[PDB]
Amino acid sequence: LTKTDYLMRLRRCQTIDTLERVIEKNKYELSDNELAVFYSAADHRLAELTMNKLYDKIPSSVWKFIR
Amino acid sequence: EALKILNNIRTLRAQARECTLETLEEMLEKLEVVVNERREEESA
Amino acid sequence: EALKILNNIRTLRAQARECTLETLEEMLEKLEVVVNERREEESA
Numbered sequence: 001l002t003k004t005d006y007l008m009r010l011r012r013c014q015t016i017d018t019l020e021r022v023i024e025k026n027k028y029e030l031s032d033n034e035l036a037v038f039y040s041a042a043d044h045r046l047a048e049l050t051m052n053k054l055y056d057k058i059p060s061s062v063w064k065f066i067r
Numbered sequence: 068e069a070l071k072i073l074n075n076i077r078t079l080r081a082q083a084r085e086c087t088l089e090t091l092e093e094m095l096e097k098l099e100v101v102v103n104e105r106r107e108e109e110s111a
Numbered sequence: 112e113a114l115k116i117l118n119n120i121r122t123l124r125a126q127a128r129e130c131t132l133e134t135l136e137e138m139l140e141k142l143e144v145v146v147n148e149r150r151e152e153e154s155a
Contacts, residue, residue, distance in 0.1 A: 039119040060096035066120050069113040080145050088149050094118045101123050102135045109132040
């Protein structure tokens with residue numbers, strides 16, 4: 001699957017805290033093969049949520065604010 | 068083990084054909100920030 | 112296998128704990144020129 005699909009599914013989660021719970025659960029559901037793009041989706045979602053500004057592409061300096 | 072082959076430009080340039088620039092860039096931008104954090108620690 | 116954990120900053124931080132700053136900087140430079148090569152071809 002594409003990371004965009006997961007991005008839209010994860011974009012429904014807010015507060016950041018809620019996202020940490022879904023990724024924690026899906027972590028034990030994924031077969032590791034889709035986890036590759038899932039990581040990008042989670043990272044992407046966290047970046048836009050942390051900067052409080054949605055962007056298609058995420059600037060390199062934004063990854064520094066990811067915990 | 069998973070870093071030794073990454074230190075060689077020969078293998079690095081070879082395995083870099085496994086994915087397109089798309090994924091390579093998204094992960095690259097994630098690595099440079101990590102190194103910076105380590106820099107801050109080594110500087111402190 | 113190695114490029115899998117490299118796509119996430121969290122996992123990357125853990126593996127970067129077994130490498131000195133020098134190695135991290137050295138590998139970053141090596142990866143940089145590799146991505147640059149791909150970028151060159153991608154734009155050319």
